[PDB]
């Protein structure tokens, strides 16, 4: 990881309350694994039916989940967790509702996070079930 992206991530990570549950050591691992991304309003982030190799956290702006009755997720929310939990394809297309700032986490690092944090693992699990 480059120093520029790393230090930038620390500022971005503050926008996701979920990570307040991590101690310094685990926080560093997650911050090292996260990748910042800006998506313009209306643009596809993930597509229904596709294999999920990563999940996302919303920093700023919002996204639109294309369920029958679409759901708009805001800062602090996460999406892409269902496929990572079930192994099944992406259950819905998710697009930028407004221009959105994101933090992406790959499946391997997602697993490491859940292994490191029982509390966070269950939040993902309950949220996925609630969404299913």
Q: Which residues bind a second copy (CB under 8 A)?
A: 1, 3, 6-7, 10-11, 14, 20, 22-24, 27-28, 32
What's the closest the beta carbon of residue 72 comes to ligand CMP, in angstroms? 9
What does 32 interact with, of ligand CMP, a second copy, none (CB < 5 to 8 A by kind)?
a second copy
What's the closest the beta carbon of residue 101 comes to a second copy, in angstroms? 17
Nearest to 56, CA basis, from 39, 32, 69: 39
How many residues line the site for ligand CMP (CB under 6 A)? 15
DSSP letter at 50? S
What does 87 interact with, of a second copy, ligand CMP, none (CB < 5 to 8 A by kind)?
none
Cβ(104)–Cβ(113) under 8 Å? Answer: no
Over the window 12 to 51, marking each residue x when it contacts ligand CMP by CB under 6 A and - when it does not, the resulting string is ----------------------------------x-----
How big is the CA angle at 43 (ends 99 and 129), to the nearest 5 degrees? Answer: 90
Q: How far apart are CA 90 and CA 72, in angstroms?
A: 17
Residue 69 vs residues 17, 35, 80, 114: alpha-carbon distances, Å: 26, 29, 18, 29
Measured on CA atoms in the order 44, 109, 123, 6, is the torsion positive or negative? Answer: negative
52 binding ligand CMP? (CB under 6 A):
yes
Binding site for ligand CMP (CB under 6 A): 46, 52, 65, 67, 71, 79-83, 90-92, 94, 131
């Amino acid at each position: 990881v480059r120093r520029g992206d790393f230090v930038r991530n620390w500022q971005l990570v503050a926008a996701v309350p979920l990570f307040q549950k991590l101690g310094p050591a685990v926080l560093v691992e997650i911050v090292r694994a996260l990748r910042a991304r800006t998506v313009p309003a209306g643009a596809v982030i993930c597509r229904i039916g596709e294999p999920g190799d990563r999940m996302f956290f919303v920093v700023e702006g919002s996204v639109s989940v294309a369920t029958p009755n679409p759901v708009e997720l805001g800062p602090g929310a996460f999406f892409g967790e269902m496929a990572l939990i079930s192994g099944e394809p992406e259950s819905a297309t998710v697009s930028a509702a407004t221009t959105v700032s994101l933090l992406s986490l790959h499946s391997a690092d997602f697993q490491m996070l859940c292994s490191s944090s029982p509390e966070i693992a269950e939040i993902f699990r309950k949220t996925a079930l609630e969404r299913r």
